């Protein structure tokens, strides 16, 4: 039951809109996923992203900048030494809170 | 409160809401007779409880969520057909139909 | 819901509470006691009997052993409530007037 | 934060925990009474450097759990000069929450 939390948020911020519907970008070949873009990301803090590939923590990188349409791109090339991630691997993407370094899963591939 | 927001993101990828209060005024202008929210949450058919100057006016049935996402709370339905004099504090609570929990969403003075 | 739990651990490193409802019965329910209530704010309680809002009353003191008792005689014009009906008990937040369910009978 | 406190009260009506950091050169961190709803792991970060995750020691009968920094720092304690952050790791999603900090 998550109404108590939702309205804890409404209490703090009356007007809020976000969209973390995952857009998985595919390089060449299509087998590989090389990016993830969110249509509308939270902007209260300059969040960072951590990527996990098949159980391997690829660490934290600087975020690409929120674009004027509110979207943000995570470029997996920046985390994976210049290579896409084969789509048979599970990919986890975390937001990292800059204040305490907390990590929250926001996207998962398979 | 980042931990709570992303708890919401975890369960609800895409969410938009707007409870910026639009205080309606009858005639005379001194009286507030309504409150309108531009875009309410719709996951549950919430209702509204109104407290006028510390007096609990109780719960009533919600007006319809309109096609633009808006929802109106008519204080005439809580205050026996009179607006609320703007010198009184007004508290509006959403009521959770599952457990009857109450959460403040708008406050006049 | 682990994010929320550790949000609490974050704000408050050490915490113990116990709201396991001890109902006071022998067919009418005359009271409800909680072994260990939260004490960060002086909470009041609102009681609803079989859907009927009996409203808010002033709280009894938290006892030395951390317990607090809600006496339904103060809410129901001096009368117990028959187990027939569903009793809901809400904590009332004195800051904003919010209320959260914390106990239910049937 | 009362709204969230009582949401926890709602989900579990009886609960006690104690994460007041017992620091023991700092070799280790002990928590008198950890949550046990999941089998949490811990991640350590030293002076900004991610030491990563290690398997957890068993929760003691008195509810306490010990994090041993020798397992995270290649057999060496951490000098109190540096800031140590300690995160619980949620085994379901891999989320991490800060639960202790040294300066």
CSV table of C-alpha atoms in Angstrom, one decimal:
chain,number,residue,atom,x,y,z
A,1,UNK,CA,0.0,0.0,0.0
A,2,UNK,CA,1.9,3.1,-1.3
A,3,UNK,CA,-0.6,6.0,-1.0
A,4,UNK,CA,1.0,7.1,2.3
A,5,UNK,CA,4.3,7.7,0.4
A,6,UNK,CA,2.9,9.2,-2.7
A,7,UNK,CA,1.2,11.9,-0.7
A,8,UNK,CA,4.3,12.4,1.4
A,9,UNK,CA,5.7,13.5,-1.9
A,10,UNK,CA,2.7,15.6,-2.8
A,11,UNK,CA,3.1,17.3,0.6
A,12,UNK,CA,6.7,18.3,-0.3
A,13,UNK,CA,6.3,19.1,-4.0
A,14,UNK,CA,2.8,20.0,-5.2
A,15,UNK,CA,3.6,19.7,-8.9
A,16,UNK,CA,5.7,16.9,-10.2
A,17,UNK,CA,6.1,15.0,-13.5
A,18,UNK,CA,8.6,12.3,-14.4
A,19,UNK,CA,9.0,9.5,-17.0
A,20,UNK,CA,11.6,6.7,-16.6
A,21,UNK,CA,10.0,4.6,-19.3
A,22,UNK,CA,13.3,2.9,-20.6
A,23,UNK,CA,14.3,3.7,-24.1
A,24,UNK,CA,17.1,1.1,-24.9
A,25,UNK,CA,19.3,2.3,-27.6
A,26,UNK,CA,20.9,-0.2,-30.0
A,27,UNK,CA,24.2,0.2,-31.8
A,28,UNK,CA,25.6,-1.9,-34.6
A,29,UNK,CA,25.0,-4.7,-34.7
A,30,UNK,CA,21.4,-4.6,-33.2
A,31,UNK,CA,22.5,-7.4,-30.9
A,32,UNK,CA,24.2,-4.8,-28.7
A,33,UNK,CA,22.5,-2.2,-26.5
A,34,UNK,CA,24.7,0.9,-26.2
A,35,UNK,CA,22.5,3.4,-24.4
A,36,UNK,CA,19.4,4.1,-22.3
A,37,UNK,CA,17.4,7.3,-22.5
A,38,UNK,CA,14.6,8.5,-20.0
A,39,UNK,CA,11.9,10.8,-21.5
A,40,UNK,CA,11.7,13.0,-18.3
A,41,UNK,CA,14.0,12.7,-15.4
A,42,UNK,CA,13.8,14.1,-11.9
A,43,UNK,CA,16.0,17.3,-11.6
A,44,UNK,CA,15.9,18.2,-7.9
A,45,UNK,CA,19.5,17.0,-7.7
A,46,UNK,CA,22.3,16.4,-10.3
A,47,UNK,CA,21.9,12.6,-10.2
A,48,UNK,CA,24.6,10.3,-11.5
A,49,UNK,CA,24.2,6.8,-12.9
A,50,UNK,CA,25.8,3.5,-12.0
A,51,UNK,CA,25.6,0.6,-14.5
A,52,UNK,CA,25.8,-3.2,-13.7
A,53,UNK,CA,26.5,-5.6,-16.6
A,54,UNK,CA,25.9,-9.3,-15.9
A,55,UNK,CA,26.7,-8.9,-12.2
A,56,UNK,CA,29.8,-6.8,-13.0
A,57,UNK,CA,29.7,-3.3,-11.3
A,58,UNK,CA,30.9,-1.0,-14.0
A,59,UNK,CA,30.9,1.9,-11.5
A,60,UNK,CA,29.6,5.5,-11.6
A,61,UNK,CA,30.1,8.1,-14.3
A,62,UNK,CA,29.3,11.7,-14.8
A,63,UNK,CA,25.7,12.2,-16.1
A,64,UNK,CA,25.1,13.5,-19.5
A,65,UNK,CA,23.1,16.7,-19.2
A,66,UNK,CA,19.3,17.0,-19.0
A,67,UNK,CA,18.2,18.1,-22.4
A,68,UNK,CA,15.7,20.9,-22.9
A,69,UNK,CA,12.9,18.4,-23.4
A,70,UNK,CA,13.6,17.0,-20.0
A,71,UNK,CA,15.3,13.8,-21.3
A,72,UNK,CA,18.6,12.2,-20.2
A,73,UNK,CA,20.9,9.7,-21.9
A,74,UNK,CA,23.1,7.1,-20.3
A,75,UNK,CA,25.8,6.1,-22.8
A,76,UNK,CA,26.9,2.5,-22.0
A,77,UNK,CA,30.0,3.1,-24.1
A,78,UNK,CA,31.2,5.3,-21.3
A,79,UNK,CA,30.9,2.4,-18.8
A,80,UNK,CA,31.9,-0.6,-21.0
A,81,UNK,CA,35.3,0.4,-22.5
A,82,UNK,CA,33.8,1.5,-25.8
A,83,UNK,CA,31.7,-1.6,-26.5
A,84,UNK,CA,27.9,-2.1,-26.5
A,85,UNK,CA,26.4,-4.6,-24.1
A,86,UNK,CA,25.2,-7.9,-25.7
A,87,UNK,CA,21.4,-8.1,-25.2
A,88,UNK,CA,21.8,-11.6,-23.6
A,89,UNK,CA,23.2,-9.9,-20.5
A,90,UNK,CA,21.1,-8.4,-17.7
A,91,UNK,CA,21.8,-4.6,-17.4
A,92,UNK,CA,21.0,-2.7,-14.2
A,93,UNK,CA,21.1,1.1,-14.1
A,94,UNK,CA,21.0,2.9,-10.7
A,95,UNK,CA,20.6,6.6,-9.9
A,96,UNK,CA,23.2,7.7,-7.4
A,97,UNK,CA,22.2,10.4,-5.0
A,98,UNK,CA,25.0,13.0,-4.9
A,99,UNK,CA,24.4,13.8,-1.2
A,100,UNK,CA,24.7,10.3,0.4
A,101,UNK,CA,25.8,8.1,-2.4
A,102,UNK,CA,22.6,6.0,-2.2
A,103,UNK,CA,21.7,4.0,-5.2
A,104,UNK,CA,18.2,3.3,-6.5
A,105,UNK,CA,17.5,0.9,-9.4
A,106,UNK,CA,15.6,2.7,-12.2
A,107,UNK,CA,15.9,0.4,-15.2
A,108,UNK,CA,16.6,-3.3,-15.9
A,109,UNK,CA,17.2,-5.2,-19.1
A,110,UNK,CA,16.1,-8.8,-18.9
B,1,UNK,CA,13.8,12.5,0.6
B,2,UNK,CA,15.4,11.0,-2.5
B,3,UNK,CA,14.8,7.5,-1.2
B,4,UNK,CA,11.1,8.0,-1.2
B,5,UNK,CA,10.7,9.6,-4.6
B,6,UNK,CA,12.7,6.7,-6.3
B,7,UNK,CA,10.6,4.3,-4.3
B,8,UNK,CA,7.7,5.9,-6.3
B,9,UNK,CA,9.7,5.7,-9.5
B,10,UNK,CA,10.4,2.0,-8.8
B,11,UNK,CA,6.6,1.2,-8.8
B,12,UNK,CA,5.4,3.8,-11.2
B,13,UNK,CA,7.7,4.6,-14.1
B,14,UNK,CA,5.6,7.5,-15.5
B,15,UNK,CA,3.8,9.9,-13.1
B,16,UNK,CA,2.5,13.5,-13.4
B,17,UNK,CA,0.5,15.3,-10.8
B,18,UNK,CA,-0.3,18.9,-9.8
B,19,UNK,CA,-2.1,19.8,-6.5
B,20,UNK,CA,-1.3,23.5,-6.9
B,21,UNK,CA,-4.4,25.0,-5.2
B,22,UNK,CA,-6.9,27.0,-7.1
B,23,UNK,CA,-9.1,28.6,-4.5
B,24,UNK,CA,-12.5,29.5,-5.9
B,25,UNK,CA,-14.4,32.5,-4.7
B,26,UNK,CA,-18.1,33.0,-4.6
B,27,UNK,CA,-20.0,36.2,-4.2
B,28,UNK,CA,-19.0,38.2,-2.2
B,29,UNK,CA,-15.3,37.6,-3.1
B,30,UNK,CA,-14.6,37.4,0.7
B,31,UNK,CA,-15.8,33.7,0.7
B,32,UNK,CA,-14.0,30.7,-0.7
B,33,UNK,CA,-16.5,28.2,-2.0
B,34,UNK,CA,-14.3,25.6,-3.8
B,35,UNK,CA,-10.8,24.3,-4.4
B,36,UNK,CA,-9.6,23.0,-7.8
B,37,UNK,CA,-6.5,20.8,-8.5
B,38,UNK,CA,-5.1,20.8,-12.1
B,39,UNK,CA,-4.1,17.1,-12.1
B,40,UNK,CA,-4.9,14.7,-9.3
B,41,UNK,CA,-3.6,11.2,-8.7
B,42,UNK,CA,-6.0,8.6,-10.1
B,43,UNK,CA,-4.6,5.3,-8.8
B,44,UNK,CA,-7.5,5.1,-6.3
B,45,UNK,CA,-10.9,6.9,-6.2
B,46,UNK,CA,-9.9,9.3,-3.4
B,47,UNK,CA,-12.3,11.5,-1.5
B,48,UNK,CA,-11.9,14.7,0.4
B,49,UNK,CA,-12.3,15.8,4.0
B,50,UNK,CA,-12.5,19.5,4.9
B,51,UNK,CA,-11.7,21.1,8.2
B,52,UNK,CA,-13.0,24.7,8.6
B,53,UNK,CA,-11.3,26.7,11.5
B,54,UNK,CA,-10.7,23.5,13.5
B,55,UNK,CA,-14.2,22.1,12.8
B,56,UNK,CA,-14.2,18.8,11.1
B,57,UNK,CA,-16.8,19.0,8.3
B,58,UNK,CA,-16.3,15.3,7.4
B,59,UNK,CA,-16.0,13.4,4.2
B,60,UNK,CA,-18.1,13.6,1.0
B,61,UNK,CA,-18.1,11.9,-2.4
B,62,UNK,CA,-15.6,13.3,-4.8
B,63,UNK,CA,-16.7,15.2,-7.8
B,64,UNK,CA,-15.6,13.6,-11.1
B,65,UNK,CA,-12.0,13.7,-12.3
B,66,UNK,CA,-12.5,15.8,-15.4
B,67,UNK,CA,-11.0,14.8,-18.8
B,68,UNK,CA,-8.2,17.4,-18.4
B,69,UNK,CA,-7.1,15.5,-15.2
B,70,UNK,CA,-8.7,18.3,-12.9
B,71,UNK,CA,-10.8,17.7,-9.8
B,72,UNK,CA,-12.9,20.1,-7.8
B,73,UNK,CA,-13.9,20.2,-4.2
B,74,UNK,CA,-17.1,22.1,-3.6
B,75,UNK,CA,-17.1,23.6,-0.1
B,76,UNK,CA,-20.9,24.2,-0.3
B,77,UNK,CA,-21.3,20.4,0.0
B,78,UNK,CA,-19.4,20.5,3.3
B,79,UNK,CA,-20.5,23.9,4.8
B,80,UNK,CA,-24.3,23.6,4.6
B,81,UNK,CA,-24.5,25.7,1.4
B,82,UNK,CA,-22.3,28.6,2.5
B,83,UNK,CA,-18.8,29.6,1.4
B,84,UNK,CA,-16.0,29.8,3.9
B,85,UNK,CA,-15.0,33.2,5.1
B,86,UNK,CA,-11.4,33.8,4.0
B,87,UNK,CA,-10.3,34.7,7.5
B,88,UNK,CA,-10.7,31.0,8.5
B,89,UNK,CA,-8.1,28.4,8.0
B,90,UNK,CA,-9.2,25.6,5.6
B,91,UNK,CA,-7.6,22.2,5.6
B,92,UNK,CA,-8.3,19.7,2.8
B,93,UNK,CA,-7.3,16.0,3.2
B,94,UNK,CA,-7.4,13.2,0.7
B,95,UNK,CA,-9.0,10.1,2.1
B,96,UNK,CA,-7.6,6.7,1.2
B,97,UNK,CA,-10.6,4.5,0.4
B,98,UNK,CA,-8.7,1.4,1.4
B,99,UNK,CA,-7.7,2.2,5.0
B,100,UNK,CA,-9.4,5.6,5.6
B,101,UNK,CA,-6.0,7.3,6.1
B,102,UNK,CA,-5.9,11.1,5.7
B,103,UNK,CA,-3.2,13.2,4.1
B,104,UNK,CA,-3.2,17.0,4.0
B,105,UNK,CA,-3.0,18.3,0.4
B,106,UNK,CA,-4.1,22.0,0.6
B,107,UNK,CA,-4.3,24.7,3.3
B,108,UNK,CA,-5.8,28.2,3.2
B,109,UNK,CA,-3.9,30.5,5.7
C,1,UNK,CA,9.6,-1.4,0.7
C,2,UNK,CA,13.2,-1.6,2.0
C,3,UNK,CA,14.0,1.9,0.7
C,4,UNK,CA,11.5,3.3,3.1
C,5,UNK,CA,12.7,1.3,6.1
C,6,UNK,CA,16.2,2.6,5.6
C,7,UNK,CA,15.0,6.1,5.1
C,8,UNK,CA,13.8,5.7,8.7
C,9,UNK,CA,17.1,4.2,9.9
C,10,UNK,CA,18.7,7.2,8.1
C,11,UNK,CA,16.8,9.9,10.0
C,12,UNK,CA,16.7,7.9,13.2
C,13,UNK,CA,19.4,5.3,13.9
C,14,UNK,CA,17.8,3.6,16.9
C,15,UNK,CA,14.1,2.9,17.3
C,16,UNK,CA,11.7,0.4,19.0
C,17,UNK,CA,8.0,0.3,18.7
C,18,UNK,CA,5.2,-2.2,19.3
C,19,UNK,CA,1.6,-1.6,18.1
C,20,UNK,CA,0.5,-5.2,18.5
C,21,UNK,CA,-3.1,-4.5,19.6
C,22,UNK,CA,-4.0,-5.7,23.1
C,23,UNK,CA,-7.8,-5.5,23.1
C,24,UNK,CA,-9.6,-5.1,26.4
C,25,UNK,CA,-12.7,-7.3,26.4
C,26,UNK,CA,-16.6,-10.4,28.0
C,27,UNK,CA,-18.3,-9.6,24.7
C,28,UNK,CA,-17.7,-5.8,24.5
C,29,UNK,CA,-14.4,-4.1,23.7
C,30,UNK,CA,-13.8,-1.3,26.2
C,31,UNK,CA,-10.1,-0.4,25.4
C,32,UNK,CA,-7.1,-1.0,23.3
C,33,UNK,CA,-3.5,-0.9,24.5
C,34,UNK,CA,-0.2,-0.7,22.6
C,35,UNK,CA,2.9,-2.0,24.3
C,36,UNK,CA,5.3,0.6,22.8
C,37,UNK,CA,4.1,3.6,20.9
C,38,UNK,CA,6.3,6.1,19.0
C,39,UNK,CA,7.0,9.2,21.1
C,40,UNK,CA,8.5,11.7,18.7
C,41,UNK,CA,5.2,13.6,18.7
C,42,UNK,CA,2.2,13.6,21.2
C,43,UNK,CA,-0.2,11.6,19.0
C,44,UNK,CA,-3.9,11.6,19.5
C,45,UNK,CA,-6.3,8.8,18.3
C,46,UNK,CA,-9.4,8.8,16.3
C,47,UNK,CA,-11.8,5.9,16.5
C,48,UNK,CA,-14.4,4.7,13.9
C,49,UNK,CA,-17.1,2.3,15.0
C,50,UNK,CA,-18.7,0.2,12.3
C,51,UNK,CA,-18.1,2.9,9.8
C,52,UNK,CA,-19.2,5.7,12.1
C,53,UNK,CA,-16.6,8.4,13.0
C,54,UNK,CA,-16.5,8.8,16.8
C,55,UNK,CA,-13.9,11.6,16.4
C,56,UNK,CA,-10.8,12.5,18.3
C,57,UNK,CA,-10.2,12.7,22.1
C,58,UNK,CA,-7.3,13.7,24.2
C,59,UNK,CA,-4.6,11.0,24.8
C,60,UNK,CA,-3.9,9.2,27.9
C,61,UNK,CA,-0.2,9.5,29.0
C,62,UNK,CA,2.4,7.1,27.6
C,63,UNK,CA,3.1,4.8,30.5
C,64,UNK,CA,6.6,4.3,32.0
C,65,UNK,CA,6.9,0.9,30.2
C,66,UNK,CA,6.3,2.7,26.8
C,67,UNK,CA,2.6,1.7,26.6
C,68,UNK,CA,-0.4,3.8,25.8
C,69,UNK,CA,-4.0,3.0,26.2
C,70,UNK,CA,-7.0,4.1,24.1
C,71,UNK,CA,-10.2,3.9,26.1
C,72,UNK,CA,-13.2,3.5,24.0
C,73,UNK,CA,-15.6,4.7,26.7
C,74,UNK,CA,-14.3,8.2,26.0
C,75,UNK,CA,-15.2,7.8,22.3
C,76,UNK,CA,-18.6,6.0,22.6
C,77,UNK,CA,-20.5,8.0,25.2
C,78,UNK,CA,-19.3,5.8,28.1
C,79,UNK,CA,-20.2,2.5,26.4
C,80,UNK,CA,-18.0,-0.3,25.2
C,81,UNK,CA,-18.2,-1.4,21.5
C,82,UNK,CA,-19.6,-4.8,20.8
C,83,UNK,CA,-17.2,-7.1,18.9
C,84,UNK,CA,-20.0,-7.3,16.3
C,85,UNK,CA,-18.6,-4.3,14.6
C,86,UNK,CA,-15.3,-3.3,13.0
C,87,UNK,CA,-13.3,-0.8,15.1
C,88,UNK,CA,-10.6,1.2,13.3
C,89,UNK,CA,-8.1,3.2,15.3
C,90,UNK,CA,-6.0,6.0,13.7
C,91,UNK,CA,-3.1,7.9,15.0
C,92,UNK,CA,-3.6,11.7,14.4
C,93,UNK,CA,-0.5,13.8,13.5
C,94,UNK,CA,-0.7,17.0,15.5
C,95,UNK,CA,1.4,18.9,13.0
C,96,UNK,CA,-0.8,18.5,9.9
C,97,UNK,CA,-3.9,16.7,11.1
C,98,UNK,CA,-3.1,13.6,9.0
C,99,UNK,CA,-4.3,10.2,10.2
C,100,UNK,CA,-2.9,6.7,9.8
C,101,UNK,CA,-4.6,3.4,10.6
C,102,UNK,CA,-2.8,1.5,13.3
C,103,UNK,CA,-5.3,-1.1,14.5
C,104,UNK,CA,-8.4,-2.8,13.3
C,105,UNK,CA,-10.9,-5.2,14.9
C,106,UNK,CA,-12.5,-7.7,12.4
D,1,UNK,CA,8.3,12.1,8.1
D,2,UNK,CA,5.5,10.7,10.2
D,3,UNK,CA,3.6,9.6,7.1
D,4,UNK,CA,6.5,7.2,6.4
D,5,UNK,CA,7.1,6.1,10.0
D,6,UNK,CA,3.5,4.9,10.2
D,7,UNK,CA,3.6,3.3,6.8
D,8,UNK,CA,6.3,1.1,8.3
D,9,UNK,CA,4.1,0.6,11.5
D,10,UNK,CA,1.4,-0.4,9.1
D,11,UNK,CA,3.5,-3.0,7.3
D,12,UNK,CA,5.1,-4.4,10.5
D,13,UNK,CA,3.5,-3.5,13.8
D,14,UNK,CA,6.4,-4.6,16.0
D,15,UNK,CA,10.0,-3.7,15.3
D,16,UNK,CA,13.3,-2.8,17.0
D,17,UNK,CA,16.6,-1.8,15.4
D,18,UNK,CA,19.8,-0.2,16.5
D,19,UNK,CA,22.3,1.1,13.9
D,20,UNK,CA,24.3,3.4,16.3
D,21,UNK,CA,27.8,2.8,14.9
D,22,UNK,CA,30.2,1.0,17.3
D,23,UNK,CA,33.6,1.7,15.7
D,24,UNK,CA,36.5,-0.5,16.8
D,25,UNK,CA,43.2,2.5,13.2
D,26,UNK,CA,39.5,1.5,12.6
D,27,UNK,CA,39.2,-2.3,12.0
D,28,UNK,CA,35.5,-2.8,12.0
D,29,UNK,CA,32.0,-1.4,12.6
D,30,UNK,CA,29.4,-3.2,14.7
D,31,UNK,CA,25.7,-2.5,14.8
D,32,UNK,CA,23.9,-3.6,18.0
D,33,UNK,CA,20.6,-4.6,16.3
D,34,UNK,CA,20.2,-4.8,12.5
D,35,UNK,CA,17.0,-5.4,10.5
D,36,UNK,CA,16.7,-9.0,9.6
D,37,UNK,CA,13.8,-9.0,7.1
D,38,UNK,CA,16.4,-9.7,4.3
D,39,UNK,CA,20.0,-11.0,4.5
D,40,UNK,CA,21.7,-7.7,3.8
D,41,UNK,CA,25.3,-7.2,2.6
D,42,UNK,CA,27.4,-4.2,3.1
D,43,UNK,CA,29.5,-1.9,0.8
D,44,UNK,CA,32.3,0.2,2.2
D,45,UNK,CA,33.7,3.4,0.7
D,46,UNK,CA,37.0,4.8,2.0
D,47,UNK,CA,38.0,8.4,1.5
D,48,UNK,CA,35.8,8.3,-1.6
D,49,UNK,CA,37.1,5.0,-2.9
D,50,UNK,CA,34.7,2.2,-3.5
D,51,UNK,CA,36.0,-0.9,-1.7
D,52,UNK,CA,33.0,-2.9,-3.0
D,53,UNK,CA,30.8,-5.6,-1.5
D,54,UNK,CA,31.7,-8.6,0.7
D,55,UNK,CA,29.8,-11.4,2.2
D,56,UNK,CA,28.1,-10.6,5.5
D,57,UNK,CA,29.1,-12.1,8.9
D,58,UNK,CA,26.3,-13.8,10.7
D,59,UNK,CA,23.8,-11.8,12.8
D,60,UNK,CA,24.8,-12.6,16.4
D,61,UNK,CA,22.2,-14.0,18.8
D,62,UNK,CA,22.0,-10.6,20.5
D,63,UNK,CA,20.8,-9.1,17.2
D,64,UNK,CA,24.1,-7.5,16.4
D,65,UNK,CA,26.1,-7.6,13.1
D,66,UNK,CA,29.8,-6.9,12.5
D,67,UNK,CA,31.3,-5.4,9.4
D,68,UNK,CA,35.0,-6.0,9.3
D,69,UNK,CA,37.0,-3.5,7.3
D,70,UNK,CA,40.0,-6.0,6.9
D,71,UNK,CA,37.9,-7.9,4.4
D,72,UNK,CA,37.3,-4.7,2.3
D,73,UNK,CA,40.7,-3.1,2.6
D,74,UNK,CA,43.1,-6.0,1.7
D,75,UNK,CA,43.8,-6.9,5.3
D,76,UNK,CA,44.5,-3.4,6.6
D,77,UNK,CA,42.4,-1.3,8.9
D,78,UNK,CA,41.5,2.1,7.8
D,79,UNK,CA,43.2,5.1,9.3
D,80,UNK,CA,40.8,7.4,11.2
D,81,UNK,CA,42.1,10.2,8.9
D,82,UNK,CA,39.7,9.3,6.2
D,83,UNK,CA,35.9,9.2,5.8
D,84,UNK,CA,34.4,5.7,5.8
D,85,UNK,CA,30.9,5.3,4.4
D,86,UNK,CA,29.0,2.1,5.0
D,87,UNK,CA,26.0,1.1,2.9
D,88,UNK,CA,23.5,-1.7,3.3
D,89,UNK,CA,22.9,-3.5,0.0
D,90,UNK,CA,19.4,-4.7,-0.7
D,91,UNK,CA,19.8,-8.3,-2.2
D,92,UNK,CA,16.5,-8.0,-4.2
D,93,UNK,CA,17.4,-5.0,-6.4
D,94,UNK,CA,21.0,-4.1,-5.6
D,95,UNK,CA,19.9,-0.8,-4.1
D,96,UNK,CA,22.3,0.7,-1.5
D,97,UNK,CA,21.5,2.9,1.6
D,98,UNK,CA,24.0,4.8,3.7
D,99,UNK,CA,23.8,3.5,7.3
D,100,UNK,CA,27.0,4.7,8.9
D,101,UNK,CA,29.7,7.4,8.3
D,102,UNK,CA,33.0,8.1,10.0
D,103,UNK,CA,33.7,11.9,9.9
